Amino acid sequence: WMFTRIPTAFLPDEDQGVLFAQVQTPPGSSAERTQVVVDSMREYLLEKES
């Protein structure tokens, strides 16, 4: 009965010290809007989660 309960995977998602963030504005946009979103993300990750 217990072999059906525990789910099967390949290899557990480990910690790496690496996080990615993928910025994507409403497209058909210029570089100013993407730069604003990027700079606000940098300000958040540097002063709020240092």
Partner: protein, 50 residues
């Protein structure tokens, strides 16, 4: 003259025929076979030709 039209900025191909990707991840409790089977139920409701 000039006409505004419609198109994608990133065109993809796979084995010599056009394509689009779909990335994702399964539920926090479910296995990989259940996500496999769920994609196998979603693909059956696609149009004929893909």
């Amino acid at each position: 003259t000039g006409k505004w039209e419609y198109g994608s900025p990133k065109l993809e191909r796979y084995n010599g025929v056009p394509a689009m990707e779909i990335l994702g991840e399964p539920a926090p409790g479910l296995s990989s076979g259940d996500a496999m089977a769920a994609v196998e139920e979603i693909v059956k409701q696609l149009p004929k030709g893909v």
